[PDB]
């Protein structure tokens, strides 16, 4: 009737990665993108399952940001709005500081927030960033899905347009696709010796050739 802000677990007859097989007992559909895929049984322990879910979420978000920052500047260079973009050679460019001191500064700045996130995972609610306004009531967020004023300034979560489970599976699926994409780009940059969009262009033309088997 209103907006439900709780994740709804998928029914036990949900579509699976391998239809006709029995989904594992530790995957009951309560997690985003739950398709019953665990051949090695790595998620048997619920605590390790929570840690692996958070790790998958983090890898998903970093991979989506990574693939966006590879593809969009590469699509701009092919269009012509970037003079000398190359994501493989981007790390060896000349900046205002050495890579080592930039790495140390990045380590400190990122280990602040990664460690605040660690404290939130260990103790939910120990660190709160959303303001405690005098009569506004802050809803309790899920671990790994925070966000009031800063991380969720759109209020697109918490049951708004698509239910929280639907948007979370969408995020997880795009993240898995981006992880596979980034690993593919990393292998293509050292195998083909070319860019991503160039490789796509030579694969779309005569796809019977210009493949993994022709370098």
């Amino acid at each position: 009737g209103g907006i439900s802000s709780v994740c709804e677990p998928l029914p036990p007859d949900r579509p699976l990665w391998f239809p006709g097989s029995t989904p594992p007992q530790w995957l009951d559909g309560s997690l985003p993108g739950d398709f019953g895929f665990d051949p090695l049984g790595l998620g048997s322990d619920p605590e390790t399952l929570r840690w692996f879910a958070q790790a998958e979420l983090m890898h998903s978000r970093w991979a989506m940001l990574a693939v966006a920052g590879i593809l969009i500047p590469e699509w701009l260079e092919s269009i012509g709005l970037m003079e000398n973009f190359n994501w493989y050679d981007a790390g060896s460019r000349e900046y205002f500081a050495d890579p080592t001191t930039l790495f140390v500064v990045q380590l400190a700045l990122m280990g602040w927030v990664e460690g605040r996130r660690w404290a939130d995972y260990v103790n939910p609610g120990c660190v709160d960033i959303e303001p405690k306004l005098p009569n506004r009531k802050n809803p309790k967020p899920d671990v790994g899905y925070p966000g009031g004023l800063w991380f969720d300034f759109m209020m697109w979560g918490r049951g708004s347009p698509e239910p929280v489970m639907v948007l979370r599976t969408k995020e997880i699926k795009n993240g898995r696709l981006a992880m596979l994409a980034f690993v593919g780009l990393c292998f293509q940059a050292v195998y083909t010796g070319e860019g991503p969009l160039e490789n796509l262009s030579r694969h779309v033309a005569d796809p019977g050739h210009c493949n993994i088997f022709s370098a």
Partner: peptide, 30 residues
């Protein structure tokens, strides 16, 4: 007469609960 009977000099003419109230305060927007 201000419940001080002694002031009865007019002596003639010249011719609501159940609503219930709660504490409401404005708060910051979304």
């Amino acid at each position: 007469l201000l419940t001080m009977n002694n002031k009865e000099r007019a002596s003639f003419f010249s011719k609501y609960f159940e609503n219930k109230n709660i504490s409401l305060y404005p708060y910051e927007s979304d």
